[PDB]
């Protein structure tokens, strides 16, 4: 049987979590994140009795291009016990939740993936790209053209300067596509991670600027590496100044960060190659729930000319689309399709990470008119580069 969990079902859920997720934050931490789950925003499958499958969405706020902020159902905590595997439990659970997500009026739903081959079938496409840059800071000399050739950056204890990080991040997320609202309970947990753990992670330090900050710490195994967990920069000045400081860490050999494909750091240095890209992976995954609500709400490029078409989502209806002067009108229709794609393919397009020509070349979105293909690339392209906010 499938149903909404009572209070009594939570102990069981945490066991399943602990057995399924190696990075399971823990019972007390998870209670903080469970405030973000709305009434009937979580489902469990009991064994006829113990819990054998679960899933839930949280109430997030995703920033999309043109600085517009959509409500987003953040899919998370999804697991099926090894004893009840390959039995229809995920399919039954991932529907139902999508029924509840759609009934609550969420234009989009989003997740972070544990494997990239599970989520495509449920209409989730990769929407942002993660991009690890590792800099050998012994050789890193800045370009003459880089800004700031007194220092405004400060080295501080992260816990002592909570409020400044909130104000900076609040600015950040509102202007950057892919940004998420970070409620108070998530800051509680983030500043709790900064403290020195007993025989595990080392102590976290912060570099603070008025327009930005970096959270970082030395890696436990590699003592000469500094893992920057989070760099939030609202101005280019802050971005440059924060990296000037990071490269000033004379203790370290290497500085690593998980950032986005258009991070300007390689161009800040004399040698572009010194900021080696060591690891690429898909970050945020999107399933567009309400196609016209999602497309209308999004901003588009002024530069491209006015154009009209009809778009089909594979088992998801068919929609007239007119884009012009950087905004779109999208309405349902029975008229013939000029473009066809699976629901996930629209997700990848939506924040502008993946080009429609690349997807078309793989035959993932079909269209006859080649001129209409080029106009999708230009239209769905994002002015501000796309970034990944935080995992959930």
């Amino acid at each position: 049987t499938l149903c909404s969990p009572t209070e009594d079902d939570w102990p069981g859920m945490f066991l399943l979590a602990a057995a399924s997720f190696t990075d399971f934050i823990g019972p007390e931490s998870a209670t903080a994140w469970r405030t973000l789950v709305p009434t009937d925003g979580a489902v469990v499958v009991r064994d006829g009795s113990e819990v054998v499958g679960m899933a839930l969405y949280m109430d997030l706020r995703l920033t999309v291009p043109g600085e517009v902020v959509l409500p987003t159902a953040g899919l998370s905590f999804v697991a099926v016990a090894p004893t009840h595997r390959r039995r229809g439990l995920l399919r039954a659970m991932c529907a139902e939740l999508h029924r509840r997500i759609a009934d609550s009026g969420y234009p989009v739903a989003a997740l972070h993936a544990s494997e990239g081959g599970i989520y495509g079938r449920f209409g989730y496409g990769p929407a942002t790209t993660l991009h690890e840059l590792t800099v050998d800071r012994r050789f890193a000399r800045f370009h003459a053209d880089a800004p700031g050739g007194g220092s405004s950056v400060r080295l501080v204890r992260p816990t002592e300067h909570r409020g400044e990080f909130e104000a900076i991040y609040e600015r950040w997320r509102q202007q950057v596509p892919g940004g998420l609202l970070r409620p108070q309970v998530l800051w509680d947990e983030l500043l709790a991670e900064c403290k020195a753990a007993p025989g595990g992670d080392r102590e976290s330090f912060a570099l603070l600027h008025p327009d930005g900050y970096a959270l970082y710490r030395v890696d436990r195994t590699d003592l000469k590496l500094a893992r920057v967990s989070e760099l939030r920069a609202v101005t280019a000045d802050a971005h440059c100044a924060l990296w000037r400081a990071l490269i000033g860490l004379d203790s370290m050999e290497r500085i690593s960060i998980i950032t986005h494909p258009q991070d300007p750091l390689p161009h800040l240095l004399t040698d572009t190659r010194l900021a080696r890209t060591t690891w690429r992976q898909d970050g945020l995954w999107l399933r567009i729930m309400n196609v016209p609500a999602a497309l209308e709400a999004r901003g588009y490029a002024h530069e491209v000319g006015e154009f009209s078409t009809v778009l089909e989502v594979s088992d998801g209806g068919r929609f007239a689309l007119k884009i012009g002067d950087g905004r779109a009108r999208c309405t349902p229709t029975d008229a013939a399709a000029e473009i066809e794609m699976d629901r996930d393919v629209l997700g990848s397009l939506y924040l502008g990470a993946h080009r429609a020509s690349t997807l078309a070349a793989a035959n993932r979105l079909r269209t006859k008119d080649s001129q209409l293909l080029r106009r999708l690339d230009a239209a769905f392209a994002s002015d501000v580069p796309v970034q990944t906010a935080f995992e959930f």
């Binding site: 994140w33 697991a79 544990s114 947990e189 959930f392």
Partner: peptide, 4 residues
């Protein structure tokens, strides 16, 4: 970095 979090949850799942």
């Amino acid at each position: 970095p979090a949850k799942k």
